[PDB]
Amino acid sequence: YQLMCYYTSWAKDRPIEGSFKPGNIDPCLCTHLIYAFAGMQNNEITYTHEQDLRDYEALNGLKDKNTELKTLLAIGGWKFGPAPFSAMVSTPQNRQIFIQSVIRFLRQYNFDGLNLDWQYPGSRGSPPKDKHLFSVLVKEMRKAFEEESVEKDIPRLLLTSTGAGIIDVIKSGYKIPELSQSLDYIQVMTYDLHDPKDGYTGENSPLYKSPYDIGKSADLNVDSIISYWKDHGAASEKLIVGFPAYGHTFILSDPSKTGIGAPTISTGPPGKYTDESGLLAYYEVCTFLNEGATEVWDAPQEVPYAYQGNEWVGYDNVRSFKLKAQWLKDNNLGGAVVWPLDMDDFSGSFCHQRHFPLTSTLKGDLNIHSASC
């Protein structure tokens, strides 16, 4: 099994006790470290900031401590959106400029591969033709990496992509059989399944549907999402299940109605460290519980939730990570990806469950072993 771990460039900019630097990642904790995010300029991959280069040296220097460790560079993300990718895949010339820039950039900065994180081909403004063009990009990039490997006699660069977790988005953006042929891994985005627009409390990443979920809401869970990817042709061993190290918050309409599917008014207030309305890092949820929130385990979805007054949070803990790890081995999946590693309790000071409680749970239950460690 693989245990991939995202490190976000903006984590070091948080208040000092909640900030995390790439050089402080345990080199033996994960099998792959993914740096989010690279930028794009003139159809070429580039760094978003000059300090990112210092982060690349620190992150890639962890490979001297674990010689089996692989590093990937992610490009895209939700805030980046689809427009730069739509323009880049539009012509063979633009795709070639991008592919050659990727090879030079990854080799220069000692990355082992690329994580395409287009959100998304075929939606958010990206036209229907991008479902085909993204597949053409992936196949051409895979071919170029194979040629580069043969010509330079070095191990081939890895090629991965995120895969949407929302069924409708999957249908309009992904040629699953073709992508599974050319990609080494697909990081399935089995998170942000809280459906904030519907007006009810929902879990960020439930393993199974709630007995009250109806229609498309009954597909907002790990089991349904991964089953859709496999039923439509993705290689089980190439699927990397997304494990969020955070939860989503809500303001309850009635502090007496605190279950899953309870009426809500809005997103909850931002946490002190992550500063994003509707989100709390796992370490911030630990503070929420420590200061008095009522913790509930939801067995039908196999995830926890917590509330205090009118604030409600749906999240993942050690038990939900353990149950999902057992489910992923039972389903013959390729492994897991922690999103983002910087929201797990990296210091051990917020949760009192040692360093990286969520990620360490996966390291143990997925039998992660490196001869270098």
Side-chain angles (χ1 to χ4, degrees), residues 44-108:
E44 293 191 331
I45 194 173
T46 186
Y47 42 96
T48 65
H49 294 299
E50 293 177 350
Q51 156 76 41
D52 300 357
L53 308 173
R54 305 285 78 80
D55 280 10
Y56 302 168
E57 183 95 318
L59 187 87
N60 295 322
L62 296 170
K63 288 190 284 182
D64 293 331
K65 290 284 188 180
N66 178 359
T67 58
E68 283 181 36
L69 181 62
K70 300 302 174 191
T71 64
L72 310 168
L73 182 57
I75 182 169
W78 173 264
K79 287 187 190 190
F80 188 83
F85 288 111
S86 300
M88 183 268 296
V89 302
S90 63
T91 76
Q93 164 168 256
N94 291 359
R95 294 194 303 270
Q96 275 304 314
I97 286 168
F98 184 68
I99 290 164
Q100 296 308 316
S101 76
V102 166
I103 294 175
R104 179 177 169 158
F105 204 84
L106 297 187
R107 296 303 191 191
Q108 173 76 253

Side-chain angles (χ1 to χ4, degrees), residues 96-307:
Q96 275 304 314
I97 286 168
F98 184 68
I99 290 164
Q100 296 308 316
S101 76
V102 166
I103 294 175
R104 179 177 169 158
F105 204 84
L106 297 187
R107 296 303 191 191
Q108 173 76 253
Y109 297 109
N110 190 43
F111 275 101
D112 301 293
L114 183 68
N115 179 225
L116 290 159
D117 187 6
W118 184 344
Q119 296 185 25
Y120 295 99
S123 67
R124 299 186 75 206
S126 161
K129 71 174 178 177
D130 290 346
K131 176 177 191 181
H132 177 248
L133 292 173
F134 174 56
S135 190
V136 166
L137 173 71
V138 162
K139 172 157 55 184
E140 293 179 348
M141 176 89 65
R142 174 60 183 263
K143 171 173 167 303
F145 286 3
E146 289 183 2
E147 289 166 1
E148 189 253 9
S149 177
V150 170
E151 79 177 282
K152 299 185 188 165
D153 300 306
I154 51 176
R156 179 177 60 78
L157 289 163
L158 285 165
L159 180 55
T160 78
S161 182
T162 57
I166 306 300
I167 310 308
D168 285 353
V169 178
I170 299 171
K171 292 181 177 296
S172 62
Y174 303 82
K175 293 190 59 181
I176 298 173
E178 285 287 345
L179 290 170
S180 195
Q181 291 286 302
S182 299
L183 298 166
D184 289 300
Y185 294 104
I186 300 161
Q187 286 94 0
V188 187
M189 301 184 292
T190 45
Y191 42 73
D192 303 326
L193 307 171
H194 56 126
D195 201 1
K197 284 195 138 151
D198 91 333
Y200 298 93
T201 57
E203 284 281 3
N204 183 36
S205 183
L207 169 57
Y208 299 119
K209 69 189 191 302
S210 169
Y212 327 129
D213 289 342
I214 54 173
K216 293 178 184 174
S217 287
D219 295 323
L220 294 174
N221 63 84
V222 173
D223 188 85
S224 293
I225 296 164
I226 296 295
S227 301
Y228 186 91
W229 280 91
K230 292 173 65 164
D231 291 348
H232 291 80
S236 196
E237 303 92 343
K238 294 190 166 182
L239 295 176
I240 303 301
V241 176
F243 280 68
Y246 64 90
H248 287 293
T249 68
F250 294 92
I251 294 304
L252 300 167
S253 298
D254 182 352
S256 277
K257 299 180 171 186
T258 64
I260 297 293
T264 63
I265 303 170
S266 71
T267 57
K272 179 179 165 61
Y273 300 94
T274 54
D275 198 34
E276 178 181 335
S277 177
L279 179 141
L280 284 178
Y282 178 60
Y283 65 86
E284 283 172 325
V285 176
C286 288
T287 304
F288 190 54
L289 298 170
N290 288 156
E291 294 176 354
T294 299
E295 186 184 340
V296 183
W297 176 255
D298 193 59
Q301 297 204 101
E302 300 298 2
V303 276
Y305 69 88
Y307 61 95

